[PDB]
Scaffold this motif. Sequence first.
Motif, PDB file in Angstrom:
ATOM      1  N   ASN A   5      -1.842   5.570   6.206  1.00 40.31           N
ATOM      2  CA  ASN A   5      -0.695   5.523   5.251  1.00 40.31           C
ATOM      3  C   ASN A   5       0.436   5.102   5.730  1.00 40.31           C
ATOM      4  O   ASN A   5       1.537   5.036   5.068  1.00 40.31           O
ATOM      5  CB  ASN A   5      -0.699   6.957   5.370  1.00 40.31           C
ATOM      6  CG  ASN A   5      -0.053   7.282   3.962  1.00 40.31           C
ATOM      7  OD1 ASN A   5       0.266   6.776   3.317  1.00 40.31           O
ATOM      8  ND2 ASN A   5       0.248   8.700   3.925  1.00 40.31           N
ATOM      9  N   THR A   6       0.648   4.739   7.145  1.00 41.94           N
ATOM     10  CA  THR A   6       1.718   4.498   7.897  1.00 41.94           C
ATOM     11  C   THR A   6       1.631   3.218   8.920  1.00 41.94           C
ATOM     12  O   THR A   6       0.479   2.770   8.883  1.00 41.94           O
ATOM     13  CB  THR A   6       2.141   5.747   8.669  1.00 41.94           C
ATOM     14  OG1 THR A   6       1.447   5.774   9.914  1.00 41.94           O
ATOM     15  CG2 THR A   6       2.398   6.998   7.919  1.00 41.94           C
ATOM     16  N   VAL A  23      -5.426  -0.815   2.205  1.00 45.68           N
ATOM     17  CA  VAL A  23      -4.794  -1.991   2.244  1.00 45.68           C
ATOM     18  C   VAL A  23      -3.982  -2.018   3.467  1.00 45.68           C
ATOM     19  O   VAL A  23      -3.328  -0.797   3.619  1.00 45.68           O
ATOM     20  CB  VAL A  23      -4.222  -2.412   0.907  1.00 45.68           C
ATOM     21  CG1 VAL A  23      -3.277  -1.437   0.415  1.00 45.68           C
ATOM     22  CG2 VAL A  23      -3.735  -3.911   1.001  1.00 45.68           C
ATOM     23  N   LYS A  24      -3.981  -3.016   4.268  1.00 41.03           N
ATOM     24  CA  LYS A  24      -2.911  -3.174   5.396  1.00 41.03           C
ATOM     25  C   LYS A  24      -2.291  -4.317   4.957  1.00 41.03           C
ATOM     26  O   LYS A  24      -3.006  -5.519   4.686  1.00 41.03           O
ATOM     27  CB  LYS A  24      -3.627  -3.417   6.690  1.00 41.03           C
ATOM     28  CG  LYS A  24      -2.852  -3.443   7.939  1.00 41.03           C
ATOM     29  CD  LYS A  24      -3.930  -3.632   9.139  1.00 41.03           C
ATOM     30  CE  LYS A  24      -4.563  -2.487  10.052  1.00 41.03           C
ATOM     31  NZ  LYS A  24      -5.745  -2.670  10.799  1.00 41.03           N
ATOM     32  N   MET A  25      -1.267  -4.470   4.908  1.00 41.90           N
ATOM     33  CA  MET A  25      -0.270  -5.594   4.449  1.00 41.90           C
ATOM     34  C   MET A  25       0.668  -5.818   5.543  1.00 41.90           C
ATOM     35  O   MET A  25       1.350  -5.112   6.175  1.00 41.90           O
ATOM     36  CB  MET A  25       0.407  -5.085   3.159  1.00 41.90           C
ATOM     37  CG  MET A  25      -0.061  -5.549   1.844  1.00 41.90           C
ATOM     38  SD  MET A  25       0.548  -4.736   0.361  1.00 41.90           S
ATOM     39  CE  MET A  25      -0.390  -5.535  -0.656  1.00 41.90           C
ATOM     40  N   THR A  26       0.642  -7.273   5.833  1.00 42.34           N
ATOM     41  CA  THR A  26       1.549  -7.516   7.200  1.00 42.34           C
ATOM     42  C   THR A  26       2.573  -8.805   6.859  1.00 42.34           C
ATOM     43  O   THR A  26       2.359  -9.564   6.232  1.00 42.34           O
ATOM     44  CB  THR A  26       0.758  -7.706   8.503  1.00 42.34           C
ATOM     45  OG1 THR A  26       0.699  -9.120   8.661  1.00 42.34           O
ATOM     46  CG2 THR A  26      -0.684  -7.254   8.229  1.00 42.34           C
ATOM     47  N   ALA A  41       2.043 -16.724   0.915  1.00 37.27           N
ATOM     48  CA  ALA A  41       2.291 -17.635   1.965  1.00 37.27           C
ATOM     49  C   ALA A  41       2.969 -16.528   3.035  1.00 37.27           C
ATOM     50  O   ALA A  41       2.840 -16.849   4.211  1.00 37.27           O
ATOM     51  CB  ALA A  41       3.584 -18.498   1.445  1.00 37.27           C
ATOM     52  N   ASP A  42       3.731 -15.642   2.687  1.00 37.53           N
ATOM     53  CA  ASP A  42       4.527 -14.750   3.635  1.00 37.53           C
ATOM     54  C   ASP A  42       4.074 -13.329   3.955  1.00 37.53           C
ATOM     55  O   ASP A  42       4.689 -12.558   4.435  1.00 37.53           O
ATOM     56  CB  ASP A  42       5.958 -14.880   3.886  1.00 37.53           C
ATOM     57  CG  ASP A  42       6.653 -14.379   2.500  1.00 37.53           C
ATOM     58  OD1 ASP A  42       7.595 -15.311   2.175  1.00 37.53           O
ATOM     59  OD2 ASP A  42       6.590 -13.182   2.016  1.00 37.53           O
ATOM     60  N   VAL A  43       3.006 -12.904   2.960  1.00 36.06           N
ATOM     61  CA  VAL A  43       2.271 -11.727   3.081  1.00 36.06           C
ATOM     62  C   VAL A  43       0.772 -11.821   3.277  1.00 36.06           C
ATOM     63  O   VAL A  43       0.177 -12.356   2.229  1.00 36.06           O
ATOM     64  CB  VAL A  43       2.852 -10.825   1.881  1.00 36.06           C
ATOM     65  CG1 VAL A  43       1.955  -9.437   1.672  1.00 36.06           C
ATOM     66  CG2 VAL A  43       4.177 -10.451   2.069  1.00 36.06           C
ATOM     67  N   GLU A  44       0.195 -11.172   4.088  1.00 36.68           N
ATOM     68  CA  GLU A  44      -1.217 -11.145   4.190  1.00 36.68           C
ATOM     69  C   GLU A  44      -1.901  -9.606   3.891  1.00 36.68           C
ATOM     70  O   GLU A  44      -1.423  -8.585   4.335  1.00 36.68           O
ATOM     71  CB  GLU A  44      -1.523 -11.498   5.629  1.00 36.68           C
ATOM     72  CG  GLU A  44      -3.239 -11.426   5.854  1.00 36.68           C
ATOM     73  CD  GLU A  44      -3.388 -11.664   7.311  1.00 36.68           C
ATOM     74  OE1 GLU A  44      -3.629 -10.804   7.933  1.00 36.68           O
ATOM     75  OE2 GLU A  44      -3.905 -12.947   7.678  1.00 36.68           O
ATOM     76  N   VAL A  45      -2.862  -9.700   3.005  1.00 33.00           N
ATOM     77  CA  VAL A  45      -3.437  -8.635   2.617  1.00 33.00           C
ATOM     78  C   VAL A  45      -4.939  -8.642   3.087  1.00 33.00           C
ATOM     79  O   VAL A  45      -5.820  -9.265   2.788  1.00 33.00           O
ATOM     80  CB  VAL A  45      -3.699  -8.983   0.847  1.00 33.00           C
ATOM     81  CG1 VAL A  45      -4.243  -7.483   0.303  1.00 33.00           C
ATOM     82  CG2 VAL A  45      -2.475  -8.942   0.228  1.00 33.00           C
ATOM     83  N   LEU A  46      -5.146  -7.279   3.876  1.00 29.52           N
ATOM     84  CA  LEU A  46      -6.558  -6.886   4.196  1.00 29.52           C
ATOM     85  C   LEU A  46      -6.910  -5.771   3.008  1.00 29.52           C
ATOM     86  O   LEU A  46      -6.243  -4.991   2.984  1.00 29.52           O
ATOM     87  CB  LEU A  46      -6.741  -6.571   5.607  1.00 29.52           C
ATOM     88  CG  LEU A  46      -7.923  -6.198   6.118  1.00 29.52           C
ATOM     89  CD1 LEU A  46      -8.417  -6.736   7.502  1.00 29.52           C
ATOM     90  CD2 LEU A  46      -7.908  -4.524   6.544  1.00 29.52           C
ATOM     91  N   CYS A  47      -8.011  -5.991   2.755  1.00 30.20           N
ATOM     92  CA  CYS A  47      -8.661  -5.065   1.794  1.00 30.20           C
ATOM     93  C   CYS A  47     -10.010  -4.455   2.176  1.00 30.20           C
ATOM     94  O   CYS A  47     -10.787  -5.530   2.188  1.00 30.20           O
ATOM     95  CB  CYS A  47      -8.605  -5.326   0.425  1.00 30.20           C
ATOM     96  SG  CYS A  47      -7.184  -6.284  -0.015  1.00 30.20           S
ATOM     97  N   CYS A  48     -10.355  -3.390   2.267  1.00 30.45           N
ATOM     98  CA  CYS A  48     -11.658  -2.587   2.492  1.00 30.45           C
ATOM     99  C   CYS A  48     -11.844  -1.723   1.755  1.00 30.45           C
ATOM    100  O   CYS A  48     -10.909  -0.874   1.032  1.00 30.45           O
ATOM    101  CB  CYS A  48     -11.334  -2.267   4.133  1.00 30.45           C
ATOM    102  SG  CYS A  48     -10.307  -1.394   4.480  1.00 30.45           S
ATOM    103  N   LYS A  52     -10.288   5.312   6.020  1.00 31.03           N
ATOM    104  CA  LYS A  52      -9.561   4.980   7.304  1.00 31.03           C
ATOM    105  C   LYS A  52      -9.639   3.185   7.925  1.00 31.03           C
ATOM    106  O   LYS A  52      -9.742   3.197   8.969  1.00 31.03           O
ATOM    107  CB  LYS A  52      -9.582   5.887   8.391  1.00 31.03           C
ATOM    108  CG  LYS A  52      -9.386   7.490   8.090  1.00 31.03           C
ATOM    109  CD  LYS A  52      -9.519   8.092   9.250  1.00 31.03           C
ATOM    110  CE  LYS A  52      -9.447   9.790   8.958  1.00 31.03           C
ATOM    111  NZ  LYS A  52     -10.480  10.630   9.635  1.00 31.03           N
ATOM    112  N   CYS A  53     -10.307   2.472   6.952  1.00 37.41           N
ATOM    113  CA  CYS A  53     -10.780   0.985   7.227  1.00 37.41           C
ATOM    114  C   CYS A  53      -9.476   0.122   7.428  1.00 37.41           C
ATOM    115  O   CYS A  53      -9.873  -0.784   8.353  1.00 37.41           O
ATOM    116  CB  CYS A  53     -11.750   0.381   6.289  1.00 37.41           C
ATOM    117  SG  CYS A  53     -11.017   0.363   4.614  1.00 37.41           S
ATOM    118  N   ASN A  54      -8.533   0.399   6.997  1.00 42.23           N
ATOM    119  CA  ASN A  54      -7.416  -0.404   7.072  1.00 42.23           C
ATOM    120  C   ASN A  54      -6.560  -0.386   8.375  1.00 42.23           C
ATOM    121  O   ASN A  54      -6.993  -0.490   9.371  1.00 42.23           O
ATOM    122  CB  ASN A  54      -6.100  -0.281   5.843  1.00 42.23           C
ATOM    123  CG  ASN A  54      -6.045   1.342   5.701  1.00 42.23           C
ATOM    124  OD1 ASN A  54      -6.814   2.081   6.069  1.00 42.23           O
ATOM    125  ND2 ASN A  54      -4.833   1.549   4.882  1.00 42.23           N
TER     126      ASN A  54
END
Length: 54
Positions: A5-6, A23-26, A41-48, A52-54
């Motif tokens: 969440n954080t 989702v984890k966005m970096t 280009a400047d934002v990466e998306v991990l989705c699972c 608590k997988c993110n």
Amino acid sequence: RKCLNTPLPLIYTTCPIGQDKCVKMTDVIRGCIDICPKSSADVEVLCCDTNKCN
């Protein structure tokens, strides 16, 4: 159902019904989601799709 969440390592919420993904966005941002947003280009998306997988 449950997602990180954080920017911190263990904190979570339970998602609104309908938000079955995490989702984890970096900076780092994490939370619940319905559809996996396209990476960019400047934002990466991990989705699972498990708790608590993110």
